[PDB]
RNA sequence: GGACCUGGCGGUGCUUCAUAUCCCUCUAGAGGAGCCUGUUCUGUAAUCGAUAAACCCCGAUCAACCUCACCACCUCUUGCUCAGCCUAUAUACCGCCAUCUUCAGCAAACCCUGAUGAAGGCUACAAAGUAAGCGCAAGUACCCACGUAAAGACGUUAGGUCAAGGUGUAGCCCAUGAGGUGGCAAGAAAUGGGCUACAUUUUCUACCCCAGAAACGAUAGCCCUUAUGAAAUAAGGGUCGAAGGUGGAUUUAG
C-alpha cells in the first residue's frame, strides 16, 4: 500500500481521549499515522456491524445505494414494530423490542454457527470434517448467509429492504431460512462426529 | 598524489577563471556560487544529479586509497599488515586493550561509513563483531577518553514530524479571528476559512453544505473534525472546493477543516486529532494502468493455460 | 532507389493525386448537393468515374519512409514502430525518452 | 535505397554468425578517375580539378587488384607446425618459455612441452554440457631441474598458459650420474602404473615412452631404458616418473649412509677400481657382510632377457635417434 | 531479455564509449539526446522531415570520414542553421581534414538550403567509459 | 579554461574528463552570454531604443487614449523553412464602452455579433483567419469592425417588428 | 564390466516457506444464451507467419479498391534501381523480442584440496579461499524514503520472426522478376478471448442522487435515411423483438 510500514492505524473513538497508557500515547506522538477512512466515523450514531453489513451488500462499488437500502430495511422494521405495538394490538412492552439496531444484532447472534465444516481429502476422497470456527468467521457467515437469502430470486418482484426486514424479524424469534441453513449445517456436523479425528488442528 | 596535487592547482585556476567571467568579481567566492554558475552555463537538465556537469576541489571528487603500506626495502609500516584489513584489526585490538584496562581499574555507525573512515573493505560479520565490542565497552562504565573514542563512531539522527504546524489567526475587514488552511485528496483541492466564534453553518462555494452535499456519509465526513473536538456548532465556515468528485471533495474539505481547527485548538487536542488520523494527507491515488494488464492490477485471463 | 516496388507504386499514386486533385475536388463539389439538377450531378459522377484510378486520394496508403511497411507507422514522424524505436533508443530523436511514468 | 543500407560491422556480424575490408581503398580513391587538391594529388600543390585518363585509371585498378590478390595469398599461407609425436596431436610440441613473473624473474633457460590435451566435459544445471580443455604440461631447463602441471580452462591457449606458470612454480631437482643418466635402476609403482627404469652407459639413447623421453630431455637425462607396465594414464605416469627421479640416492648419499667407498668397476675400462663417492668424514672399518645368495625380489622379464627365453618381435627395433 | 541499444557483456575486453555503453532507459537520466530540434516539442511541426535529414547526415558523415569518427555525432539547429560536433581521431593529416570539412559544409548547405558550419573534436583514441 | 567533469561516475572512478565528452557537446551551452557580456551588449544597444512616453501603468490611461487592442503572434521554429500558418492569425479586442459612440447601436451591435462580446467585461473581439498574410488579415478585421459599427448606427425599416 | 564426478529427475526423507500464492478462506468473473472477433476444421480458382506454459482483438496504433504478398485473365522485358525476387533456409545470422524473471546469481584472473582424476573450495568463539567485471541493490521517473513503473546479468528453450529492415548460403532471371483488369473472407461445425444480458441493488423519464412511472433482454435481420469515399464500412430512425429466467466437471483475476 501507499502507506509505509512506518504508518500506523488511527484509533478514532473519542472517549479514549477523556482521562502504560501514557507510554502508549508518547509512542503514538513519536510515530506517524494513517488518515481516517470514510465509513468509520467519530459520530455517536455509527454502528460498526451495520457498516460492515452495508459494505457486504454493496455491489459495483456503489455504496450510497447500499446505504440507502440498509436504512430502508431499518425503517421497515421500525414500522412493523410500531404496527405490532401502538395502534393495532396491545402495547406489549416486554415481547416487542422497538430498537431496530438491537433486533438486527439479535438476529446476527442467532445466525452464528458454532461449528463449521472444512473439506479434507484422505486416501483419494473428500470428507466433510467439523471444525470450531473463530468468532469473526462466524460473524461473517451470519451476515453473508442473510444477504444471500435476501438476494435469492425465488422472492421475485419484492424489493430488497422489505425482504431483509422480514428476514431480520424471523431471525429475532428463531425462524426463517438462514436459521434453517444453520441448523442443517449443525446436523451435518453432528453426522460427521467420527470424522473429528481426520482433523489435524 | 602528484597528479592529484596538479589537479588541485588546475581546479583553483578554473575557479578563478569562472570568477573572472561572472559578475561576482572576487577570486574568493563560495562553492554554492560556483555550482550555480555551472548550472547557468552548462545546463544539462538531466534527472540523475550525478550525471550533471560539475567541477570541484578534487579531494571531494576522487576516492582516496591508503597508498603505500610498505616503504622502500619491504618492511610494512603497520604491525598487523599480514592479517590483511589491518586497520580494522588494529582498532579491535585497541578496543580490547581499553576493555582490559577498564577491568583492571574496576545512533551507531553504518557499514559504508565505517569503510569510508577506514579505507579497507569490511564484511558484515566483522562489522557486527565491532558493534558488539562497542556495546560491551559502553556497558563497562568508562573514563572520558574512552567515551570520546566511542563517540567518534556514534552519530545523531534528528527526529522530525510529530507536531502539527499551527497556522496564523488573522483579522480582515472587522475584528474576526479567521484561519486559512488547505487540503488535497484524490485530485480534489480545498481551501477552508474557519472563523473563531460565529456559531452556525458551513458554506461550500457559497452554497450551504446541506445542499452541496446531499448524501449522509458526506455530511458525516464534513462534521467529523468538529465533532471530535467537541466544538460542533460554534464556528461558521466559508470553503472553496475544486477538482475531483463528491466523496474526495468532502474528504479534502474535512482535512482543511481539521487544519483550520488546529490554528485555535489546545495542543493536546490537536495531538489527539493527529493520532485519530484526520490531519494527514492520505496519499492513496488512482494507480497508473499498465500496458500488459486490463486494469491497474487485473491481468488478462489464461496466464497458466 | 526507393525501398521496394510497393513504395514506388505509392509514390506514383501520390504524384497522380497531386496532378489531378483540383479537378477531382471540383467534380465532388458538383456532385455533393441538393442544390441544382440531377442530370448534371449524374454527368459529374460519370466524369469522375472516367477519370483514372490512383489519381484517387483514397488509394494513397501510408508507409514508413525508411522500410516500406504499412502498419505501426506514426504519422507524426512517418516511420515504422521498429525504425522509430531504433532511432529513439540510440538518442537520435530529440525529446523522445522512455516512459518511466 | 540509401536509407535501407547500414554500417559495415553489423553486416559483418550477420555474415559471420558467431552467436547462435576497408584497408585497400584510400580516402581519395574513386571508380571514376578524379584528382582533388586535398587527397589523391600532391598535397594541395598541382592545384586543379584534373581527371585521370581511361588508361591510367585502368592501370590503377589493375594494381589494386594485384595488391588484393597478394593480400589474399598472404592470408592463405600455412605456417609449419612442428610435428609433436603425431601430426594432429598436442604431444611433444613445444610452447615457448613460460611468461615472466610479476617482479620480473625470467625463465629463458626453461622449455615447455605438452604431454596431453583432453576435452573434458561437465553437465551443469542450465548450461548443459560444458566443453572444457584440460592440459598436462611439463617444464625443464636441462641441468636436472624440472616439473609439471594440469592447467584446465574453457580455451586451449589459456589452459596452456596457466599450466606453464604452474609448472614453473612447482619444480623438482633430479640428481644425475654425470650429465647423462639416472644413478641406478628404478622400480616404482605409482597408483596402477608400474615403471621399471634401467641405468645405461653413454651412447645408448633414450629408449622409453614418448612422454618419458620428452620429460627426460627436459630434465637433462640423456640416455636410458624404461618399461611402463600396468595402466598408461598419462598423469599417473608423469607423476610416478617424477617421484622416481626425486627418490634416487646419490653415490655420495650412499657413502654417507654406509661409510665405505662407492667404487665402480667397468667392463669397458679394465679391472681398475674407480672410486666415485667417498664419505665426507669418518670411515667404517668393518667391511660389508657379504651374506651370499642375496634376497632381492627380482623381476621375471629381466631374467628372461638375460636367459633368452622371451623373444618378442617388437623388442630390439631400429628407431630414430631418441 | 530486452536488448535494444545496450552493448552486451561478453568478456572484460570490449572497450566501450559513454554514449555507446548506456541503455535506452537512461536517455533522460544518465545520457543526452544527440540531435536537437524544435519539431518534437508540442504543438510544433516538421518533425518527420527533420528526422529523415538527421538520419541522412550521420550516414553522410560516416561515409566521408572513414575510421575518423570516435563517437556518434551531435546535430543542432538554430532557426536557419545546422551545427555539427564530430569527435574525430588524430589519424589523417590536418590538411586532408580541412579539405574535407569545407566540402562537406558546401555540399550540405546546397542540399538543405541551410548554412552548415561543423566543428571538429580531435582526440587521439576512443574515450573509453567501460571495459565492458 | 574550466576543468568541468561531465558524466555518470564509473562504479569506483570519476565523472568523465573535459577533453573528449559527447555529453558536454550535447548540452545547449551558455559560454557566450556571461552576465558581464550581456551587460556590455545591453550598453551597446542603448541606441536602437526610443523610450516610451508617460501614458502610464494600470492600462486605464492607455485605454482612455488608445482604444482597440490588436494582438497577433509569430512563432520561431527551427529548420530551413519559416512558413508557419498559425502566425498569420489576428484578433482585435476592443472595449465597447471605450468606443463611446453608440446609443441604439449598443443594442444592435451585440445582436449582430453572437459569440463575441463578453458581458462581464464589455469587450468586442473579432478574430480574422481567412486570408494568408497577417497585415491583410488585420486590415480586414479593422474594416469588418468599421462596417459593423456603421450597420449598427444605420437602422433599417424592418427593425420595428421586435 | 567395476568404482567414482558433475548434472537432470524421484507418485524422495526432514525443516522452513509461498501472503492473491499452495490449500482451506474472500470478492468478481469464464464455461450455459445471443452476439463481437480470433483460431481450428471445412469450403474456396485464392495468402503467409504465431499455434503448451512462452499461440488464439496475436504481426494488424486495422484487409471495400488500395493495403497485397494471394487467385484468374491480359501485357512487359535493361526493366523506379549499375536490375529485381514478400523465392528456399529463423537449424547460417544481425536486428528486435518471449521465457524461467513474481530470481540473485553469473563471472575473468589467481590460490588451495583431490598421492597434481572428472571435480570441489561452506563453519565469525570461523576448517582455504581472494577477486576486478556484469546483475541484484543503490541512484532515477511518477503523487515522498511507501507504491508502481523502469530496470533484470549468464544461460535455457537450435523458443518467435529471412513477410520490419538488412544480409550469409542456395536457387528463379521472356519468370518464383515487373505492370494492368477482375476477384478472393463464408461457415455443417468445434474452440479461445471480449461485449450484453438474463431483471427489482431492477427498466424508463426527470435530476445527475429526497422524485414520479414500469413488472426485461437486446441482437439477427427488414426497410429507410445520414457519414465516408470514384465505389458500401460506420452513424441514426422505424419495424421487429430471438435465445436467455445466473451457468455442469472445471477454471481466471485481484
Ligand atoms: Mg596427419
Ligand atoms: Mg521484458
Ligand atoms: Mg510477387
Ligand atoms: Mg516491468
Ligand atoms: Mg535496480
Ligand atoms: Mg525453431
Ligand atoms: Mg516456427
UniProtKB/Swiss-Prot annotation, chain A:
A GO biological process held by the record: translation
Location in or out of the cell: Mitochondrion
Keyword set, alphabetical order: Acetylation, Disease variant, Mitochondrion, Primary mitochondrial disease, Ribonucleoprotein, Ribosomal protein, Transit peptide
Principal subcellular localization: mitochondrion
UniProt superkingdom: Eukaryota
Subunit structure: Component of the mitochondrial small ribosomal subunit (mt-SSU), essential for mitochondrial protein synthesis. Mature mammalian 55S mitochondrial ribosomes consist of a small (28S) and a large (39S) subunit. The 28S small subunit contains a 12S ribosomal RNA (12S mt-rRNA) and 30 different proteins. The 39S large subunit contains a 16S rRNA (16S mt-rRNA), a copy of mitochondrial valine transfer RNA (mt-tRNA(Val)), which plays an integral structural role, and 52 different proteins.
Family listed: Belongs to the universal ribosomal protein uS7 family.
Protein name as it appears in the record: Small ribosomal subunit protein uS7m
Organism: Homo sapiens (Human)
UniProtKB/Swiss-Prot annotation, chain C:
Any one GO BP annotation for this protein: translation
Domain of life: Eukaryota
GO cellular component: mitochondrial inner membrane; mitochondrial ribosome; mitochondrial small ribosomal subunit; mitochondrion; nuclear membrane
Subcellular location, record wording: Mitochondrion
Signal peptide: none
Family named by the database record: Belongs to the universal ribosomal protein uS14 family.
Binding partners and assembly: Component of the mitochondrial small ribosomal subunit (mt-SSU). Mature mammalian 55S mitochondrial ribosomes consist of a small (28S) and a large (39S) subunit. The 28S small subunit contains a 12S ribosomal RNA (12S mt-rRNA) and 30 different proteins. The 39S large subunit contains a 16S rRNA (16S mt-rRNA), a copy of mitochondrial valine transfer RNA (mt-tRNA(Val)), which plays an integral structural role, and 52 different proteins. Interacts with LIAT1.
Name of the protein in its database record: Small ribosomal subunit protein uS14m
Lineage, highest ranks first: Eukaryota, Metazoa, Chordata, Craniata, Vertebrata
Gene: MRPS14
Included range, full protein: 28 to 128 of 128
Curated annotation (Swiss-Prot), chain D:
Keyword line: Mitochondrion, Ribonucleoprotein, Ribosomal protein
Gene Ontology annotations for the cellular component aspect, listed alphabetically: mitochondrial inner membrane; mitochondrial small ribosomal subunit; mitochondrion
MF terms in GO: RNA binding; structural constituent of ribosome
Compartments it resides in: Mitochondrion
Keyword tRNA-binding: no
Subcellular location, principal: mitochondrion
GO biological process: mitochondrial translation; translation
Residue ranges of domain S5 DRBM in the record: 110-174
Domain of life per record: Eukaryota
Record bears the keyword Cell membrane: no
Family statement: Belongs to the universal ribosomal protein uS5 family.
Subunit organization: Component of the mitochondrial small ribosomal subunit (mt-SSU). Mature mammalian 55S mitochondrial ribosomes consist of a small (28S) and a large (39S) subunit. The 28S small subunit contains a 12S ribosomal RNA (12S mt-rRNA) and 30 different proteins. The 39S large subunit contains a 16S rRNA (16S mt-rRNA), a copy of mitochondrial valine transfer RNA (mt-tRNA(Val)), which plays an integral structural role, and 52 different proteins.
Protein's recorded name: Small ribosomal subunit protein uS5m
From Swiss-Prot, chain E:
Keyword set includes Iron: no
Signal sequence annotation: none
Transmembrane segments: none
Protein name listed in UniProt: Small ribosomal subunit protein uS3m
Span within the parent record: 36 to 167 of 167
Subunit structure comment from the entry: Component of the mitochondrial small ribosomal subunit (mt-SSU). Mature mammalian 55S mitochondrial ribosomes consist of a small (28S) and a large (39S) subunit. The 28S small subunit contains a 12S ribosomal RNA (12S mt-rRNA) and 30 different proteins. The 39S large subunit contains a 16S rRNA (16S mt-rRNA), a copy of mitochondrial valine transfer RNA (mt-tRNA(Val)), which plays an integral structural role, and 52 different proteins.
Keyword flag rRNA-binding: no
GO-annotated molecular function: RNA binding; structural constituent of ribosome
GO process annotations (BP): mitochondrial translation
UniProt organism field: Homo sapiens (Human)
Family: Belongs to the universal ribosomal protein uS3 family.
GO cellular component: mitochondrial inner membrane; mitochondrial small ribosomal subunit; mitochondrion
Keywords, sorted A to Z: Mitochondrion, Ribonucleoprotein, Ribosomal protein, Transit peptide
Cellular compartment(s): Mitochondrion
Amino acid at each position: 500500500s501507499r502507506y509505509s510500514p512506518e504508518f500506523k492505524d488511527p484509533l478514532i473513538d473519542k472517549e479514549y481521549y477523556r482521562k502504560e497508557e501514557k507510554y502508549v500515547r508518547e509512542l503514538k506522538k513519536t510515530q506517524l499515522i494513517k488518515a481516517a477512512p470514510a465509513g468509520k466515523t467519530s459520530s455517536v450514531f455509527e454502528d460498526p456491524v451495520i457498516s460492515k453489513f452495508t459494505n457486504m451488500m454493496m455491489i459495483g462499488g456503489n455504496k450510497v445505494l447500499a446505504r440507502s437500502l440498509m436504512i430502508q430495511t431499518l425503517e421497515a422494521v421500525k414500522r412493523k414494530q410500531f404496527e405490532k405495538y401502538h395502534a393495532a394490538s396491545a402495547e406489549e412492552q416486554a415481547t416487542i423490542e422497538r430498537n431496530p439496531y438491537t433486533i438486527f444484532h439479535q438476529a446476527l447472534k442467532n445466525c452464528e454457527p458454532m461449528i463449521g465444516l472444512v473439506p479434507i481429502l484422505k486416501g483419494g476422497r473428500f470428507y466433510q470434517v467439523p471444525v470450531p470456527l473463530p468468532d469473526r468467521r462466524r460473524r461473517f457467515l451470519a451476515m453473508k448467509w442473510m444477504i444471500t437469502e435476501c438476494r435469492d430470486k425465488k422472492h421475485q418482484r419484492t424489493l430488497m429492504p422489505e425482504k431483509l426486514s422480514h428476514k431480520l424479524l424471523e431471525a429475532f424469534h428463531n425462524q426463517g431460512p438462514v436459521i434453517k441453513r444453520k441448523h442443517d449445517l449443525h446436523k451435518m456436523a453432528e453426522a460427521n462426529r467420527a470424522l473429528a479425528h481426520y482433523r489435524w488442528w | 598524489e602528484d597528479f592529484i596535487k596538479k589537479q588541485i592547482e588546475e581546479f583553483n585556476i578554473g575557479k578563478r577563471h569562472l570568477a573572472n567571467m561572472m559578475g561576482e568579481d572576487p577570486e574568493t567566492f563560495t562553492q554554492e556560487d560556483i555550482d550555480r554558475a555551472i548550472a547557468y552555463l552548462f545546463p544539462s537538465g538531466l534527472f540523475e544529479k550525478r550525471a550533471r556537469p560539475v567541477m570541484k576541489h578534487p579531494e571531494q571528487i576522487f576516492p582516496r586509497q591508503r597508498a603505500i603500506q610498505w616503504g622502500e626495502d619491504g618492511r610494512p609500516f603497520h604491525y598487523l599488515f599480514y592479517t590483511g584489513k589491518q586497520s580494522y584489526y588494529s582498532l579491535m585490538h585497541d578496543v580490547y586493550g581499553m576493555l582490559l584496562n577498564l577491568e583492571k581499574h574496576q545512533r551507531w555507525l553504518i557499514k559504508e561509513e565505517l569503510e569510508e573512515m577506514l579505507v579497507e573493505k569490511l564484511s558484515d560479520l566483522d562489522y557486527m563483531q565491532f558493534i558488539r565490542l562497542l556495546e560491551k565497552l559502553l556497558t563497562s562504565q568508562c573514563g572520558a577518553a574512552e567515551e570520546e573514542f566511542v563517540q567518534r563512531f556514534r552519530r545523531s539522527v534528528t527526529l522530525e514530524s510529530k507536531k502539527q504546524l499551527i497556522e496564523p489567526v488573522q483579522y480582515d475587514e472587522q475584528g474576526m479571528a479567521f484561519s486559512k488552511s488547505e487540503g488535497k485528496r484524490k485530485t480534489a483541492k480545498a481551501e477552508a476559512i474557519v472563523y473563531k466564534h460565529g456559531s452556525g453553518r458551513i458554506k461550500v462555494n457559497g452554497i450551504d453544505y446541506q445542499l452541496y452535499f446531499p448524501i449522509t456519509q458526506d455530511r458525516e465526513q464534513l462534521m467529523f473534525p468538529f465533532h471530535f473536538v467537541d466544538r460542533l456548532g460554534k464556528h461558521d465556515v466559508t470553503c472553496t472546493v475544486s477538482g475531483g468528485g463528491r466523496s474526495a471533495q468532502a474528504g479534502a474539505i474535512r482535512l482543511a477543516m481539521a487544519k483550520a481547527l488546529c490554528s485555535f485548538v489546545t495542543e493536546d487536542e490537536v495531538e489527539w486529532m493527529r493520532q485519530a488520523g484526520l490531519l494527514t494527507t492520505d496519499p492513496r491515488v488512482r494507480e497508473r494502468k499498465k500496458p500488459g494488464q486490463e486494469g491497474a492490477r487485473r491481468k488478462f485471463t489464461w496466464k497458466k493455460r | 532507389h526507393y525501398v521496394d516496388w510497393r513504395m514506388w507504386r505509392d509514390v506514383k499514386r501520390r504524384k497522380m493525386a497531386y496532378e489531378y486533385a483540383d479537378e477531382r475536388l471540383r467534380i465532388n463539389s458538383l456532385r455533393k448537393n441538393t442544390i441544382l439538377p440531377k442530370i448534371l450531378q449524374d454527368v459529374a459522377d460519370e466524369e469522375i468515374a472516367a477519370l483514372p484510378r490512383d489519381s484517387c486520394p483514397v488509394r494513397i496508403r501510408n508507409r514508413c519512409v525508411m522500410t516500406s511497411r504499412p502498419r505501426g507507422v506514426k504519422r507524426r514522424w512517418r516511420l515504422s514502430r521498429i525504425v522509430f524505436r531504433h532511432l529513439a533508443d540510440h538518442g537520435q530523436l530529440s525529446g523522445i525518452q522512455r516512459a518511466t511514468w | 535505397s540509401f536509407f535501407t543500407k547500414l554500417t559495415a560491422d553489423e553486416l559483418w556480424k550477420g555474415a559471420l554468425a558467431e552467436t547462435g575490408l576497408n584497408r585497400g581503398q584510400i580516402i581519395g580513391e574513386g571508380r571514376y578517375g578524379f584528382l582533388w587538391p586535398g587527397l589523391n594529388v600532391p598535397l594541395m600543390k598541382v592545384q586543379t580539378i584534373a581527371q585521370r585518363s581511361k588508361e591510367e585509371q585502368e592501370k590503377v585498378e589493375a594494381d589494386m587488384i594485384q595488391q588484393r590478390e597478394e593480400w589474399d595469398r598472404k592470408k592463405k599461407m600455412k605456417v609449419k607446425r612442428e610435428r609433436g609425436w603425431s601430426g594432429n596431436s598436442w604431444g611433444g610440441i613445444s610452447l615457448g618459455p613460460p611468461d615472466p613473473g610479476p617482479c620480473g624473474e625470467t625463465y629463458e633457460d626453461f622449455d615447455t612441452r605438452i604431454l596431453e590435451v583432453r576435452n573434458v566435459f561437465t553437465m551443469t544445471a542450465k548450461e548443459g554440457r560444458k566443453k572444457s580443455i584440460r592440459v598436462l604440461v611439463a617444464v625443464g631447463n636441462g641441468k636436472g631441474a624440472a616439473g609439471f602441471s594440469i592447467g584446465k580452462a574453457t580455451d586451449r591457449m589459456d589452459a596452456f598458459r596457466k599450466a606453464k606458470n604452474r609448472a614453473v612454480h612447482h619444480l623438482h631437482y633430479i640428481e644425475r650420474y654425470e650429465d647423462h643418466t639416472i644413478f641406478h635402476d628404478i622400480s616404482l609403482r605409482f597408483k596402477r602404473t608400474h615403471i621399471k627404469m634401467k641405468k645405461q652407459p653413454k651412447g645408448y639413447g633414450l629408449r622409453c615412452h614418448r612422454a618419458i623421453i620428452t620429460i627426460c630431455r627436459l630434465i637433462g637425462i640423456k640416455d636410458m631404458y624404461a618399461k611402463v607396465s600396468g595402466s598408461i594414464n598419462m598423469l599417473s605416469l608423469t607423476q610416478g616418473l617424477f617421484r622416481g627421479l626425486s627418490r634416487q640416492e646419490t653415490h655420495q648419499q650412499l657413502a654417507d649412509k654406509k661409510g665405505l667407498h662407492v667404487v665402480e668397476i667397468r667392463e669397458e675400462c679394465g679391472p681398475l677400481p674407480i672410486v666415485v663417492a667417498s664419505p665426507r668424514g669418518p670411515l667404517r672399518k668393518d667391511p660389508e657382510p657379504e651374506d651370499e645368495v642375496p634376497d632381492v625380489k627380482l623381476d621375471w622379464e629381466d631374467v628372461k632377457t638375460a636367459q633368452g627365453m622371451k623373444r618378442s618381435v617388437w623388442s630390439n627395433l631400429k628407431r630414430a635417434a631418441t | 531479455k530486452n536488448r535494444a541499444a545496450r552493448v552486451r557483456v561478453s568478456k572484460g575486453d570490449k572497450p566501450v564509449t559513454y554514449e555507446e555503453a548506456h541503455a535506452p532507459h537512461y536517455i533522460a537520466h544518465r545520457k543526452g539526446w544527440l540531435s536537437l530540434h524544435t519539431g518534437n516539442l508540442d504543438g510544433e511541426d516538421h518533425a518527420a522531415e527533420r528526422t529523415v535529414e538527421d538520419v541522412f547526415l550521420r550516414k553522410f558523415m560516416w561515409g566521408t570520414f572513414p575510421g575518423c569518427l570516435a563517437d556518434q555525432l551531435v546535430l543542432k539547429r538554430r532557426g536557419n542553421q545546422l551545427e555539427i560536433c564530430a569527435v574525430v581521431l588524430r589519424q589523417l593529416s590536418p590538411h586532408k581534414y580541412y579539405f574535407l570539412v569545407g566540402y562537406s559544409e558546401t555540399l550540405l548547405s546546397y542540399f538543405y538550403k541551410c548554412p552548415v558550419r561543423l566543428h571538429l573534436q580531435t582526440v587521439p583514441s576512443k574515450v573509453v567509459y567501460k571495459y565492458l | 579554461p574550466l576543468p568541468v567533469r561531465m558524466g555518470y561516475p564509473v562504479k569506483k572512478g570519476v565523472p568523465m574528463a573535459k577533453e573528449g565528452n559527447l555529453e558536454l557537446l550535447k548540452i545547449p551551452n551558455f559560454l557566450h552570454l556571461t552576465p558581464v557580456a550581456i551587460k556590455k551588449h545591453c550598453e551597446a544597444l542603448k541606441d536602437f531604443c526610443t523610450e516610451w512616453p508617460a501614458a502610464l501603468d494600470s492600462d486605464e490611461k492607455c485605454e482612455k487614449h488608445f482604444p482597440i487592442e490588436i494582438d497577433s503572434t509569430d512563432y520561431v521554429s527551427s529548420g530551413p523553412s519559416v512558413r508557419n500558418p498559425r502566425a498569420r492569425v489576428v484578433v482585435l479586442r476592443v472595449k465597447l464602452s471605450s468606443l463611446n459612440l453608440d446609443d441604439h447601436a449598443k443594442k444592435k451591435l451585440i445582436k449582430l455579433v453572437g459569440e463575441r462580446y463578453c458581458k462581464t467585461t464589455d469587450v468586442l473581439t473579432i478574430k480574422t483567419d481567412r486570408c494568408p498574410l497577417r497585415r491583410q488579415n488585420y486590415d480586414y478585421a479593422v474594416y469588418l469592425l468599421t462596417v459593423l459599427y456603421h450597420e449598427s448606427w444605420n437602422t433599417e425599416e424592418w427593425e420595428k417588428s421586435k
